């Protein structure tokens, strides 16, 4: 697990952890005994993506973005009808080592 981060407010927040296989899990900090919301980020006839890097936008708790070993930037929304991977970027001919929003 190369990436784990926290958002939500002071009065309510979530722990967000993405792994190498592409499984996301929501966690509490008080309790780590089970994940809360946990699913798998897939695209391209549901291939399992190989997520390396992570960025949040500032002020966003629902939408976010990943980079990958597959040369592919994906943004992805957390919940709703388009919970999961939104879409796809191209241009890199290497495995992506780090992303950061402004």
């Amino acid at each position: 697990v190369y990436c784990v981060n926290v958002v939500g407010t002071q009065n309510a927040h979530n722990l967000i952890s993405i792994s190498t296989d592409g499984k996301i899990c929501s966690w509490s900090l008080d309790m780590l005994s089970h994940p809360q919301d946990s699913m798998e980020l897939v695209h391209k006839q549901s291939k399992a993506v190989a997520v390396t890097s992570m960025s949040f936008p500032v002020g966003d708790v629902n939408n976010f973005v990943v980079g990958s070993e597959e040369g592919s930037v994906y943004t992805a929304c957390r919940h709703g009808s388009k919970a999961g991977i939104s879409e796809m970027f191209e241009g890199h001919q290497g495995p992506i080592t780090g992303i950061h929003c402004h």
Binding site: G8, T9, N11, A12, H13, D60, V61, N62, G80
Partner: protein, 104 residues
């Protein structure tokens, strides 16, 4: 030839389905129990997004009104996603007000 119009008709019927199933009960949700500026702002953002789709013709099966419909639903999607993140901030404020089950 008729299968292109039938899918676009399916898109407009499912659009009016999700819009009416938001719209007719989101007034009951944002009714204060007997007023904010944010509630009427969210209602008028739903109304403005509905006019932002409904100025675009649904009957243009050709490509330009199809992608104008795409820009209309993308503007709609971003606008009710902004409203949805505001009520998601109110959802974090739901345990921001509460601790026990009854008021939740």
């Amino acid at each position: 030839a008729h299968r292109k119009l039938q899918a676009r008709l399916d898109q407009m019927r499912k659009f009016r389905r999700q819009h009416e199933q938001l719209r007719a009960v989101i007034v009951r949700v944002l009714r204060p129990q007997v007023f904010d500026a944010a509630d009427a702002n969210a209602i008028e953002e739903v109304n403005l997004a509905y006019e932002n789709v409904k100025e675009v013709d649904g009957l243009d099966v050709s490509k330009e009104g199809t992608e104008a419909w795409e820009a209309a639903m993308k503007r709609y999607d971003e606008r009710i996603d902004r409203v949805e993140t505001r009520i998601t901030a109110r959802l974090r404020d739901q345990l921001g007000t509460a601790k026990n089950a009854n008021e939740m």
